[PDB]
């Protein structure tokens, strides 16, 4: 799931 955090 894409997040603005890695």
């Amino acid at each position, epitope marked *: *799931l894409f*997040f*603005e*955090v*890695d």
Partner: antibody
Amino acid sequence: QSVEESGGGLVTPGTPLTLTCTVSGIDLSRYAMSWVRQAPGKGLEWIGIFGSLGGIFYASWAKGRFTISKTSPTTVDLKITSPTTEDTATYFCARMPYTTDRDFWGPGTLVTVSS
Amino acid sequence: DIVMTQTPSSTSAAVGGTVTITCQASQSVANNNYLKWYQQKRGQPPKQLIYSVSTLASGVPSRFKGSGSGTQFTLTISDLEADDAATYYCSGYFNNNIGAFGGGTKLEIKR
């Protein structure tokens, strides 16, 4: 690849206080910055994060008490709206990835809330 | 809210021994692998040890090992050295876009 906080020191309870996080060699158009704090002798506490796409997220207990913003391609701010005694702590700005090892923390800046 | 319970709060072991630190999250981390292990010493910021639950960070000795499911995680330190005296933290991220830390584990090296 380095991070540095500034704007720490002594502040009066109730006086707004803005900390600034300056990065070098870190691309804030593709990676997020986090604000963490640590009271003397206690554990790390997650305050919030400015995400890679402009999302701003706060801890449940920090909403209202803090405002995070990006002020320039290399700087991110943490404004404590109405400081109280319990907000005394060392404040860290960090490039703290959970799924990579490109992990860079600033040295931290001590904020003391007292009259 | 979201809670990460880290045990033990403090422990001791001799050089060459092994210590095991457990982190128990109240819900699964984001993508089932947003979990990093940090080591912090006095007056310094934390220094990474493990990312993605189990991957060894560049430059970290292999005697640091991370494992876990999606909600319970383990940091194992083997072949203890004097340099390992510090406080260790688990750092997690969650699907509601929330980060959290465990309460920390202070390790004293016996001698």
